[PDB]
A paper describes a structure:
As mixing [name] with the branched compounds leads to protein precipitation and thus prevents co-crystallization, the direct study of complexes was not possible. Therefore, we soaked the [name] crystals with monomeric fucoside 2, 3 and 4, respectively. Crystal structures confirmed that all the studied fucosides were able to bind the lectin [name]. In each complex, the electron density was clear enough to determine the position of the fucosyl part of the compounds in 6 out of 7 fucose-binding sites of at least one [name] monomer unit – A or B, while site 2 is occupied by Met60 of the neighbouring monomer, as was observed previously. The second saccharide unit was clearly assigned for all three fucosides 2–4 in sites 1 and 3. For fucoside 3 and 4, the second saccharide was also distinguishable in sites 4-7 of at least one protein monomer. Considering fucosides 2–4, the position of the bridging methylene group is close to the α-Me-Fuc O1 atom, which is not directly coordinated by the protein in the complex. The O4 of the d-arabino-hexopyranosyl unit in fucoside 2 and 4 is coordinated by a glycine backbone nitrogen in sites 1, 3, 5, and 6, while the O6 atom of fucoside 3 is linked to a tryptophan backbone oxygen in sites 4 and 6. When comparing the overall orientation of the second hexopyranosyl unit of fucosides 2–4, it is similar to the galactose unit of blood group H trisaccharide, with minor distortions in individual binding sites influenced e.g. by crystal packing. The second saccharide unit of studied fucosides was only marginally coordinated by [name] binding sites what, together with affinity comparable to monosaccharides, suggests a low importance of this type of compounds for inhibitor design.
As a part of our ongoing programme focused on host-pathogen interactions at the molecular level, we identified a lectin in the [name] genome designated [name], which we prepared in a fully functional recombinant form. The lectin [name] interacts selectively, mainly with l-fucose and oligosaccharides containing terminal l-fucose residue, and prefers an α-glycosidic bond over a β-linkage. The [name] lectin forms a seven-bladed β-propeller assembling into a homo-dimer. Both units contain two types of binding sites situated between the blades and have different amino acid compositions and binding preferences.
Author numbering:
A (entry chain B): 26 to 369
B (entry chain A): 23 to 369
The structure:
Amino acid sequence: TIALSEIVSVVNTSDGRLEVFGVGTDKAVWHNRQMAPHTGSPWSGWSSLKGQVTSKPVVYINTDGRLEVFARGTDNALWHIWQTATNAGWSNWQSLGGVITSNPAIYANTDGRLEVFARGADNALWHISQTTAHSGPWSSWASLNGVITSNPTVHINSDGRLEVFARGTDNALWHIWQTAPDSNLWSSWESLNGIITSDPVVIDTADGRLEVFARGADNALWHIWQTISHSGPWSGWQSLNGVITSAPAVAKNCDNRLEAFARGTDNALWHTWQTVSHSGPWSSWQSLNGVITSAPTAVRDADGRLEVFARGTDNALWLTWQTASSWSPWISLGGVLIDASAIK
Amino acid sequence: TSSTIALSEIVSVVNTSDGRLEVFGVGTDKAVWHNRQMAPHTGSPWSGWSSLKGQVTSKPVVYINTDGRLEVFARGTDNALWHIWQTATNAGWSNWQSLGGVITSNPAIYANTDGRLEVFARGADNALWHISQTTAHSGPWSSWASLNGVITSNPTVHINSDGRLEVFARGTDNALWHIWQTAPDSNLWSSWESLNGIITSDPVVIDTADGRLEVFARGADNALWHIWQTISHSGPWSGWQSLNGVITSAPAVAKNCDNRLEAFARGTDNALWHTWQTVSHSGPWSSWQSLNGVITSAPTAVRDADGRLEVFARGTDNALWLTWQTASSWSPWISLGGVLIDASAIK
Ligand SMILES: CO[C@@H]1C[C@@H](C[C@@H]2O[C@@H](C)[C@@H](O)[C@@H](O)[C@@H]2O)[C@H](O)[C@@H](CO)O1
Ligand SMILES: CO[C@@H]1C[C@@H](C[C@@H]2O[C@@H](C)[C@@H](O)[C@@H](O)[C@@H]2O)[C@H](O)[C@@H](CO)O1
Ligand SMILES: CO[C@@H]1C[C@@H](C[C@@H]2O[C@@H](C)[C@@H](O)[C@@H](O)[C@@H]2O)[C@H](O)[C@@H](CO)O1
Ligand SMILES: CO[C@@H]1C[C@@H](C[C@@H]2O[C@@H](C)[C@@H](O)[C@@H](O)[C@@H]2O)[C@H](O)[C@@H](CO)O1
Ligand SMILES: CO[C@@H]1C[C@@H](C[C@@H]2O[C@@H](C)[C@@H](O)[C@@H](O)[C@@H]2O)[C@H](O)[C@@H](CO)O1
Ligand SMILES: CO[C@@H]1C[C@@H](C[C@@H]2O[C@@H](C)[C@@H](O)[C@@H](O)[C@@H]2O)[C@H](O)[C@@H](CO)O1
Ligand SMILES: CO[C@@H]1C[C@@H](C[C@@H]2O[C@@H](C)[C@@H](O)[C@@H](O)[C@@H]2O)[C@H](O)[C@@H](CO)O1
Ligand SMILES: CO[C@@H]1C[C@@H](C[C@@H]2O[C@@H](C)[C@@H](O)[C@@H](O)[C@@H]2O)[C@H](O)[C@@H](CO)O1
Ligand SMILES: [Cl-]
Ligand SMILES: [Cl-]
Ligand SMILES: [Cl-]
Ligand SMILES: [Cl-]
Ligand SMILES: [Cl-]
Ligand SMILES: [Cl-]
Ligand code: NA
Ligand code: NA
Ligand code: NA
């Protein structure tokens, strides 16, 4: 098991509008986007990209601006659908084959080739890549071994080497990395210890260090990081306190202060944030109210403000964002969303 | 046909792989020197100046590879394009090496969507020539090739929100001209096209929060002018609009935390002045305001790791001086020392 998942995948697109992808009651992928590149913009409303999915769908932006959505299909293969251009429509759904048993995790190599990581039926971490920048065709599937028990998450280091994180069979946080950018050469699997009870969430700090967040065995939010830009040694685990009842979501304010969000024991949204600067101490947890039924999903918009999405008690997606003085009242974006996470 | 441009910037600035500001300029010895923040925060102490040696006959221009490695390009004493690079991300530097060619402008650099750096410069024949890395963030480099044209300023390159590189330069009729890749990563380019106007500076290009290119340049009336792609990207640009002012240097433009553009230029009194969008990145421009100082170059503007604009400019003592945004105002001008010269291949 893992902490309740994020229900949507969201990005700030090439034209500065937020765009969210979720799964409907019909198992199709639906999406919704801002009309305008600003906090409080009207929304398109929900429209279906069709498909039938059996994981969380995850959107990623190609290095040419085009959105591409990845999800497991009803045959357990990895499937995908992409924009034909940044302000045009979408391709047909296409299979990338394989048999997978987690949500896909996606990142762009420094050379522009997307690389997708997913758990296999043998519980090892598998991967596949675009053979040339922001384009098909793709490589064949290969394994990076291990035995993982959570959805994997990938990020890139400040020197260009991808690094993948996942919970191990001992419930510790484990990781593996490219030994050079764009490479098929990887390190050994190594343990960062800890006991984690959510999927990991990985971010890069302003000063070039990977930092991972997860719920711990005590249901507090815990975090651990590289002590040097793109290098070990790692810190020990440190608690950010709280008692959280979902996965956390983390995003950067426009000044690079990190801010974490999670559902609390009263089912409200709560958050804690760095104060003063991106090197400063973390605040106490404070409530943003609401009554939520998923983990929150956080993103910085084109006005440099954080916006947070979460499924509501009616199964619609609701939204709250930063104001000068505070946060805005919760508003509904409608829809009926389900948690399709391949690992729960 | 103009053979001059507004006074240039004195340094090339970059945000490092670990979020620090690092600047590059030319010493009185004609070597490339550099200076960086100790820490990624507004008001950090600086390392002080250290030499990367070389002997340059252009402005040296830094760019950051997609693997985090800094790379500096400069015209050499033999008029070839030369470069020097970090051998590892944020660590040691290579020796200077020649990429050949015969160039007659400062170089301008961008990364393609596939991670290949591509360098543009005016040639001996006055056309725009170009050369690229053959593989992502690595040598060896391609053959030199021409994009034709006849150009009379330093070129400036930027990338479209769909990954197509686009180069801008002054033409023989003093207008702003441009040329673009027809696909990302490609050697297929459009023809040269005119955006009209009269420009009296190098063009300055940026990408807005909503994914459009916008170009700024001093006009024939010495005001700051700008022009932009439209939201439909359908061929037409906006037509030129004045931001007024009377400026005596090239402009610098950067994005604030919230993506509001902000422009900087020297005034008739040799102070730094600035004008900014208000409310949002779609908002209207303010009137000009002085940031005082007495400066002897164009300003160079950049946003730091705390989300604050920092602005550098050469001072009356030929040292590099610096002022930054505070919550309230802007900080007093402070000196980073050094003795810098303007080595621009076109002035
Ligand atoms: C007419 O069928 C094609 C393939 C469908 C893809 C569906 O969705 C995929 C993700 C997989 O789950 C497939 O098993 C599933 O059929 C897709 O939904 C449909 C409409 O866009 O086109
Ligand atoms: C002794 O074998 C080492 C470490 C293994 C890591 C495995 O996968 C990790 C992610 C954890 O679940 C571990 O508990 C588990 O043994 C790993 O699979 C193996 C081959 O790559 O080498
Ligand atoms: C006075 O009530 C409003 C709406 C509440 C929103 C709640 O939380 C939302 C996220 C949804 O789940 C709604 O169905 C749910 O009622 C919200 O918590 C409250 C906080 O001041 O104001
Ligand atoms: C008037 O109905 C439209 C389409 C609805 C789409 C809903 O939300 C989608 C995500 C799927 O779950 C659909 O099955 C579900 O009906 C959506 O709930 C509603 C919100 O105002 O607008
Ligand atoms: C002893 O010479 C080598 C290459 C030199 C590069 C110099 O600087 C380059 C940028 C070019 O202008 C060359 O023509 C010029 O020689 C460089 O300055 C020197 C470092 O001490 O080593
Ligand atoms: C026969 O001339 C056309 C347009 C030329 C563009 C040139 O280069 C431009 C940048 C401007 O300076 C123009 O005034 C100049 O003629 C261009 O060089 C030539 C070859 O492609 O075709
Ligand atoms: C198609 O462009 C022309 C020239 C423009 C003015 C010129 O171009 C501007 C950029 C400045 O340099 C001005 O001083 C100069 O007069 C002028 O703004 C415009 C009038 O509609 O038409
Ligand atoms: C009442 O005159 C002021 C100064 C003008 C700014 C001009 O442009 C600035 C950038 C500097 O060069 C100034 O010295 C120059 O006067 C400014 O544009 C004008 C707006 O009404 O008010
Ligand atoms: Cl759990
Ligand atoms: Cl992305
Ligand atoms: Cl001039
Ligand atoms: Cl305006
Ligand atoms: Cl004033
Ligand atoms: Cl000088
Ligand atoms: Na964006
Ligand atoms: Na393998
Ligand atoms: Na000249």
